[PDB]
Amino acid sequence: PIHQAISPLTLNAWVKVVEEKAFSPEVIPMFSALSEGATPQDLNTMLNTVGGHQAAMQMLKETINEEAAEWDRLHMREPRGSDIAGTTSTLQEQIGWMTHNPPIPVGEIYKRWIILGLNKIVRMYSPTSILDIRQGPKEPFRDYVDRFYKTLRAEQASQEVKNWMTETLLVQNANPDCKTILKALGPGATLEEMMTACQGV
Amino acid sequence: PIHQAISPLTLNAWVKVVEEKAFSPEVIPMFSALSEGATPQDLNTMLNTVGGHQAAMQMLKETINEEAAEWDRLHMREPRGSDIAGTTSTLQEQIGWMTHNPPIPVGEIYKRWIILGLNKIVRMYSPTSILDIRQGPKEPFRDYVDRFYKTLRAEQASQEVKNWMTETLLVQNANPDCKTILKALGPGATLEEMMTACQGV
Amino acid sequence: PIHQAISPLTLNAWVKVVEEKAFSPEVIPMFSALSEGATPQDLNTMLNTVGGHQAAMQMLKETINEEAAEWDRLHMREPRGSDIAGTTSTLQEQIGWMTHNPPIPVGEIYKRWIILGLNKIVRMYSPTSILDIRQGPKEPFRDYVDRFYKTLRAEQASQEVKNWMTETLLVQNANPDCKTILKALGPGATLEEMMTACQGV
Amino acid sequence: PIHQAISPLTLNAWVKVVEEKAFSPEVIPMFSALSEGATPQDLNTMLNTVGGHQAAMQMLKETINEEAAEWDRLHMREPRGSDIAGTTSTLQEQIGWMTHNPPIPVGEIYKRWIILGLNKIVRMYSPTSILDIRQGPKEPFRDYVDRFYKTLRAEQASQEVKNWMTETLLVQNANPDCKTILKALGPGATLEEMMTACQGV
Amino acid sequence: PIHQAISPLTLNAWVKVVEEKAFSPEVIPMFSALSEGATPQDLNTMLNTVGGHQAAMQMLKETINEEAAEWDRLHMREPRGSDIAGTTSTLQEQIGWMTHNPPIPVGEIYKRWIILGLNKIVRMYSPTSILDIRQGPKEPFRDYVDRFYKTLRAEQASQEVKNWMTETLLVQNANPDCKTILKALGPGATLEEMMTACQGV
Amino acid sequence: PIHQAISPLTLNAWVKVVEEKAFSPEVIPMFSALSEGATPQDLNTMLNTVGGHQAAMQMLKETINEEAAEWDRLHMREPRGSDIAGTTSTLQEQIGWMTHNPPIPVGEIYKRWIILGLNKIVRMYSPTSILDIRQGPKEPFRDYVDRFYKTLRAEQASQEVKNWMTETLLVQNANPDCKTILKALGPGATLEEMMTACQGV
């Protein structure tokens, strides 16, 4: 990235993460950490290298096409949608644009589109919905909380709904004894206080 | 590549990929990502190192000979076919040509020929044809789509035929229940909509 | 860190340590050794990458919110709490602040907050309390001391209480024979003297 | 090589290749790719490090002696055979010669001699001769071609004989059905055409 | 060390050595080879990272306290004991002292103290004393010598006592036949002569 | 070496080779390839790190003492034996001597002494003598030659004796059939000719 060719120690890491972690919600920060300040011709190389999950990678290409069309409708030379995707642009043109004054972050825009696509694909790949997660009969409370939040991390929503869900839904799905202990704890109890009060059981 | 010798951490990676991934359609982007801005005398070293699959590597040499003959018929000194292949050229001559003003991308041309050869060899190595891929009796729809597109990726064709194949052939090979659900969904349904509507079954 | 992107050889190491060592008390120095002189936008990348233990990572985010609120109440432009956390700041603004004269160590402050959060989370994750650790019937004294101190390392307290605990509590929980040998050794005996006197048994 | 000492990441790779791949015909390009622009005092270090196969490495030393004697008979100071082999020369003398104007490629000459020796040793290590390779009763044609060419790669001969062997001998050793299909295909059929016509069986 | 942060490829190596080799007498040279010209704030990071063996690492801290107290009693600004240990000093102060003219080797002093502590801890961790090592009934003489010297390496003593022990004690503990052969060899026999004379048995 | 500290990627390689390869005759070139242009204070670090084989490493120290005494008897300031060994010299003095004009290769001398010691130790560690190596009843001739030369490599002797041994002793120990075939081949037969004539059996 920003010129020098992308090192094989990065492509192998990206391929290995996608192969092993599947599309768990932690793939998105890994993608944004591996490719920093990269031209679109590097994200394309980073995306085509993924061996399996071609059906879920075409869906990411559909999303790229939609965003490119929206930018093209909205709008050196003018950067159009097919130029942001890096499929109708030369390496010299992109590097000159990224080093121009003022610079146009074509790579940054493509990275943002990929992040949107990855958010949507991971959202679909979530196994089950939050309302289906229920506390087990004999299960440590730390395990239950660390499963509930892992499920909630995949879904994305506005802070008002999520804040309501974390505060109230969590205490609703507990077993009778844990529900009584949470109720006895009372309102305004932070997560640490809830877990440390109910850690004995 | 562009002068410095190619690092062993790249030859080992290229050999290991070809040995393990065989000629799955993801080998082509890996080849184009490992060797960037490389002289033809580096692609030759990257090709001879492949241990097995010598029959499919001679076919890549036949394709190189055909393309070299076509360029020689079409046409410092003049770059002929035997000079593009790097077998009748000196390292000093190639480096001088690649640093000359204007530069002649002899390495780029050889890389393009190898990409054409790799496309043809992978096309032959595809196990079965698209029309043979049929949905199973009890099989998740995501699995079926991610097998159908993996098979379709190997074949290369014009966008008009492929667009027709992806839109219509996919809905033709489904089982009666999935075919009914797809038909009830109606025209203009994108891939994400099809999969999310039929994900319940 | 301090500009250049964080190498993947560091993110993989941090993820692997947290995955394997869990939250044993040695994670805190590992975290402070991996990220030196790093902008807050690097600690965020280092924290989001952790796959599991999301419940214990949200608690670290609650602690970050509390510390950010306290700083905001206490107080280029003024660095507020949401700016220290790196969620409402640009990379250019942070780098300029960290290279400004005089420099404001926003990254250092965030690192200190994370260290406080990590201390609290590890303190909670300690399996059992010191008073529950008792010497076994037939157990080497070195093993007993190296289990007692490992348990005591997780708990953090003022030096006066800890000095009292190490000097007196250690000799209180021994078996009758080891208690007699420690008493025969007498006051002012350092740890090495205690272990080398009682190493025979 | 060209001054800096040879990195251990190269000696380990060379030792591991020779240990694992034995003397398969792909060792020669690996040797020519690992040591580029290297002084003779580096090839000697790269040759002595090989643990096993000392009998086949002495034969490479016999070949070096023969070539050195021929050069000595044929012919700063004059580079003689014992000087090309690097056993009677100082590092300063070799580096000065390799940086002199005009430079004498003593390292290149030694590398060429080693390549000749390696060609001869691999030729001897070939398991069986081409005429012994016969198509099996029930064997895929791709497997047969990829075994026939692997055997033919070890033997080295003039292009006229090899071209005759590849065109005619290949179609002679086939089974009756494959021989009939090849004959029905007719003259001028390239390797790809032969394999794709007979791939069905 | 001497400014740049310590690479993770060194902390992992140090942790892995201490975890695997335990406190065998070869840990001391490994510690002195990993950290060269390092500030005290790097040795502290290298010491806290050790996961297990906390009891034997507190003893190393007791030794550090003793040496720091002795230096403080013995004695920019004056470097006191709590300043040598790096717990009451800033990174800027230490770097300035280590780059000052004349430079004060605070890091070197801390390294020497750690070496003294490591010598003492390894001395305690030695399994058995030299006088307990006896030659077996049917045991190769090379094995016996290579066990005797490994035990003697852990103990540290003045050269006069050790020279007496190596010359005389070694020949005292042999079996009757080996004792007769050693006696027949006579005085002034070096170790190589003893082993090569008695290697037949 | 020549100033910068020795990388841990070299110490680990040296320790791993000595641990695995034991003292096979290929350890000597590995030692001379790992440490090039190194000060004596680096060879000492490279020697002390070896975990096992302390008996055979003390013998290398005895040899160092003998060579140091001989140099001291034979003879900035004068480099004496205890100064060549690096045990009574400062790093500044050695670096200044190695960068002085004219430079004194104290490191080179120590390296040569270690090579002499390693030759002697490997010579002792050879399992059996050449005269004990006999051809088996049913054994491939290549295997026999590659065992005979491996044994002969450990022993070091003048070229006149070794040339006599390779030419005549090799043909003396063969079985009757191979002895007849070698005799029928006649005088002046090189190793390759002998092996290729007798390779059929």
Residue numbers in the entry:
A (entry chain A), B (entry chain A), C (entry chain A), D (entry chain A), E (entry chain A), F (entry chain A): 1 to 2, 12 to 84, 96 to 221
Which sentences from the paper describe this structure?
The HIV-1 capsid is a fullerene cone made up of hexamers and pentamers of the CA protein. The ability of the HIV-1 CA protein to generate two different capsomers is controlled by a molecular switch—a Thr-Val-Gly-Gly (TVGG) motif—that adopts two distinct conformations which dictate whether a CA subunit will form a hexamer or pentamer. Here, we show that these Arg18 mutant CLPs contain a non-canonical pentamer conformation and distinct lattice characteristics that do not follow the fullerene geometry of retroviral capsids.
In contrast to WT CA, which forms tubes under the same conditions, the R18L CA assemblies are more capsid-like in morphology. CryoEM maps centered on the R18L hexamer and pentamer were refined to nominal resolutions of 3.7 Å and 4.4 Å, respectively. A comparison with published structures indicates that the R18L CA hexamer is very similar to the WT CA hexamer found within native capsids and in vitro assembled fullerene cones. Lacking the IP6 binding site, Arg18 mutants are insensitive to assembly induction by IP6 but readily assemble in 1 M NaCl.
